[PDB]
Design a protein around this ligand. Structure first.
Ligand SMILES: [Zn+2]
Ligand SMILES: [Zn+2]
Ligand SMILES: [Zn+2]
Ligand SMILES: [Zn+2]
Ligand SMILES: [Zn+2]
Ligand SMILES: [Zn+2]
Ligand SMILES: [Zn+2]
Ligand SMILES: [Zn+2]
Ligand SMILES: [Zn+2]
Ligand SMILES: [Zn+2]
Ligand SMILES: [Zn+2]
Ligand SMILES: [Zn+2]
Ligand SMILES: [Zn+2]
Ligand SMILES: [Zn+2]
Ligand SMILES: [Zn+2]
Lengths: 289, 287
């Protein structure tokens, strides 16, 4: 009940907790650990299940949630090797969606994620610890690039963060996922939270809202907010799991290889079964207490 | 009690058949494509960024990276058929044939033959012929089937010789600064094949041509694994011949190249794979 790592709302962190998280992230970048996460996600993005399909190991299929859960767990263990006091916080974007100007959220402060893109600098982030020249970036190929970009709400398809209602409506869906286990799956928790139902919604919508590297699959984890975004997605999934006790992961069999309960998820040997119970992985979200 | 990795040439017709079947089962199950992608992803993971070193090539981790790769592949073979171990292609012996394309490794019952020049060098023989065996391109999408063009380039008309191997075995240090394709008096770099290259390991890649000829696509060819088993054997001999010596760098190399660093895309370290006996296998000629 207190033996569990607690994953907290960013906004509930002390100035010291915020500072310790930023320091761990910067240490992981300098050591070479952070870039492993950029590459895993990109490689997973280009690994199709099966070949020629528009499904991949990490997106547009059943493995989206368990893939990202293992991803966050590995990243958290690396944070903890720098500083065991640190756990992964979540960005509750559905709350920030209530602000007149969501760029005023303390997540975007110079002491945390830093601010929106500067439009006079072709939308380079020139504030916070991950500003251009304080924080290097990788392009689609794996070679260096020009620094972090962000353009909050700049596309017509995602002018807005998802709302508490978007989240609650997804939480009502009775099945984890449905055939054909892809971006067309109807009445699918996985697919609706992923955000492909009348998309971009929810998870996809937050990616497109931030824009910059965060806006496209190959580069998204260049932005540390990638992890705060995905911690919130993982929390929302963990709530669905309590609300629907009778329900389990799908498919259990006859999905593409890498999408089944007991299949390994490229680029790891980790299976969905291995990550279904988040308590057994040794963590809880603060609101589960 | 040790699993025995044998010379292809020392395999029974049944051992040859059982190996081909395990490889085809791994392809059908979806396991094989994980190996293609790991290698390609590792190829595009630079240590550090902007460098021409990567996790799997052109640096100290080349040999331990490939050793872990082969071990993982062998364990997956064994889950299909526990009787199966990874064979090695002793290319330095084949190099003594007037026409190394006559080697029984290239028979229709095993790797199948050279590219057909009337078919833009598509392999149209053996179990991995176009239309029996799918391939992945540089980007991870399907492609036209296996190609091979034995000896077709001016830079690699020839397989490496027993002399090339023995001369590399005499080099007194595993690797040297700056831990890349310029490393001089480096076992790793000379066996990798960058000293007056393409030599040895790189030369066998360029000699075969087709997908085997370039980093992103090479494991589309099962011979990739027989090639690399021979590289791993040759390294294992160097390790006995040079007791005084161990892996380098131990520290102050790029992250992912140090003895105790993890090798993208795994957590496996060079230290974890230095002793091949402890990993539970030997090459047949160690008996
Ligand atoms: Zn693709
Ligand atoms: Zn522009
Ligand atoms: Zn995402
Ligand atoms: Zn993603
Ligand atoms: Zn229910
Ligand atoms: Zn398991
Ligand atoms: Zn709280
Ligand atoms: Zn013999
Ligand atoms: Zn590159
Ligand atoms: Zn020899
Ligand atoms: Zn190779
Ligand atoms: Zn290679
Ligand atoms: Zn010596
Ligand atoms: Zn270790
Ligand atoms: Zn033998």
């Amino acid at each position: 009940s207190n033996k569990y790592r607690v994953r907290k709302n960013v906004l509930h962190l002390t100035d010291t907790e915020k500072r310790d998280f930023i320091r761990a992230v910067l240490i992981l970048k300098e050591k070479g650990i952070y870039d492993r996460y950029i590459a895993w996600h990109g490689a997973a993005g280009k690994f199709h299940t099966p070949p020629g399909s528009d499904r991949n190991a990490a997106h547009m299929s059943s493995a989206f949630l368990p893939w990202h859960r293992e991803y966050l767990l590995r990243f958290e263990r690396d944070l903890q090797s720098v500083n065991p006091e640190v756990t992964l916080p979540y960005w509750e974007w559905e709350t920030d969606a209530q602000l007149q100007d969501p760029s005023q959220s303390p997540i975007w402060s110079a002491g945390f994620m830093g601010g929106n893109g500067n439009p006079k600098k072709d939308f380079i982030v020139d504030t916070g610890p991950f500003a251009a020249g304080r924080w290097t970036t990788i392009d689609e190929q794996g070679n260096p690039s020009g620094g972090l970009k962000r353009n909050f709400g700049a596309t017509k398809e995602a002018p807005t963060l998802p709302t508490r209602d978007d989240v609650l409506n997804a939480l009502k869906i009775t099945q984890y996922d449905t055939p054909p286990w892809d971006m067309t799956s109807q009445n699918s928790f996985r697919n609706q939270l992923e955000g492909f139902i009348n998309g971009p919604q929810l998870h996809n919508r937050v990616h497109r809202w931030v824009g910059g590297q965060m806006g496209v699959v190959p580069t998204a984890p260049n932005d540390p907010v990638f992890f705060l975004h995905h911690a919130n997605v993982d929390r929302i999934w963990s709530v669905w799991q309590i609300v629907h006790r009778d329900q389990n992961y799908q498919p259990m069999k006859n999905g593409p290889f890498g999408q089944n309960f007991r299949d390994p998820m490229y680029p790891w040997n980790t299976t969905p079964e291995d990550v279904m119970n988040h308590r057994k992985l040794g963590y809880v979200y603060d609101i589960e207490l």
